[PDB]
Amino acid sequence: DVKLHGSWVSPFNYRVIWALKLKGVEFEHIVEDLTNKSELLLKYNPVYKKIPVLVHGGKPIAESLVILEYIEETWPENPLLPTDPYERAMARFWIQYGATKTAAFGALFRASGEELEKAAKEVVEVLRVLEEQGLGDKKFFGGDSINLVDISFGLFTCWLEAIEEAAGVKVLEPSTLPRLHAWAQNFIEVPLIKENIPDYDKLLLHMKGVREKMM
Amino acid sequence: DVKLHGSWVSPFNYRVIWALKLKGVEFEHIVEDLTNKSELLLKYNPVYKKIPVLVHGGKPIAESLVILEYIEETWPENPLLPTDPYERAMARFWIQYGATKTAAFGALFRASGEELEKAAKEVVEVLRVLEEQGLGDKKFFGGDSINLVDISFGLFTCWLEAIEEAAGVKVLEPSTLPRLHAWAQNFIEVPLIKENIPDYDKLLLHMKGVREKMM
Ligand SMILES: [NH3+][C@@H](CCC(=O)N[C@@H](CSCC(=O)c1ccc(-c2ccccc2)cc1)C(=O)NCC(=O)O)C(=O)O
């Protein structure tokens, strides 16, 4: 009844896996080879031709953020968004902030030496705004347990760690971002996340290859 | 109780005016001078320092798309989104598509001659995807009346007309985009929109100035 066209390394696909597992929704995972996209992927997502794509009752939903809100509305038990409209607006605001700022991380795989240090400091400032104004003193973006905002920021955990190792730069460190670094550790320790993350060695190999391609 | 920090020309501010007027919500409009931003604007929107900003009960909500969803959740009567989760996901999908593709219009105020023709054809293709896959044969993106998707695309009416005149290029024409061109005319004729749009001559003057700045 539920199919997920995805991948073993995409952080965007993992957002959907986490949301489905938090809802207890059974699904079939269909791994796509992006160098030879299936006929179903091209039919289901003609606008972007990207994964993930959720297919529910044969109807497709593309774009991880759109999929996450569809899951929250379709399986409302175990809520992943607050009930209060102002708190829901703040959650959407921070999700949107992450979506817009994800592009700033691209420079980490394009710049060298004294230019790469500049890109890293700019990414630290993006994360500092998120830490100070978004997370604050809460354990998670969702308070005492993870919500759609934590899920949307999950790419800043093992994927960002792999990016830092591939590029030879440090961004999310405890001295510079104490609360965000503690959050990243707490997020990765949540059993649902711990049991559903790519193997670090395989993820690092993938990131080194993406960096090689972008020079 | 409701304040809107805005402007007389911003299409993003007009999205919020339309949503508030469709809900029958009384509000005070506070026009911001972006060359000398008020202390309230900087306090209410420290992340982006942009308008619009809605202030409801003294609590601020920045980003037009976030504001629109807050208005829909706070004043649920006269709904501006469908009830079905799949239809709601499609609405969010197209709103997101417009938000990402709005950047492609920037090239219309940066390119010249045989390069500007290329930027215009790329923008026509963005609109053709929206027309074929989003609007289809419906009168409005919301069916028989306007919804948040029509509101999000309202910038493709008089603002885009002004951009076409300022740059000397044609993008949204009836021969090339028959259904989208009919939609744009129908949208502008909705009494709520007709009574709440900037004066075209003033909007054109503003667009000519933005183009002069971007060369
Ligand atoms: N907006 C879409 C994006 C999906 C997408 O790009 N899908 C790719 C495959 S996944 C991309 C990925 O491997 C990747 C990995 C890590 C990051 C990352 C991590 C941390 C910090 C910053 C960046 C970002 C992206 C695709 O189908 N591609 C189609 C094709 O290329 O043919 C969504 O939200 O679903």
Ligand SMILES: [NH3+][C@@H](CCC(=O)N[C@@H](CSCC(=O)c1ccc(-c2ccccc2)cc1)C(=O)NCC(=O)O)C(=O)O
């Ligand atoms: N993501 C924000 C954007 C808001 C924004 O950019 N605000 C500007 C003022 S408005 C921008 C505008 O005048 C404008 C006009 C027309 C278009 C347009 C029209 C049609 C087709 C394509 C593009 C796009 C933008 C600001 O505060 N600026 C802060 C500052 O510059 O100091 C939102 O959705 O609220």
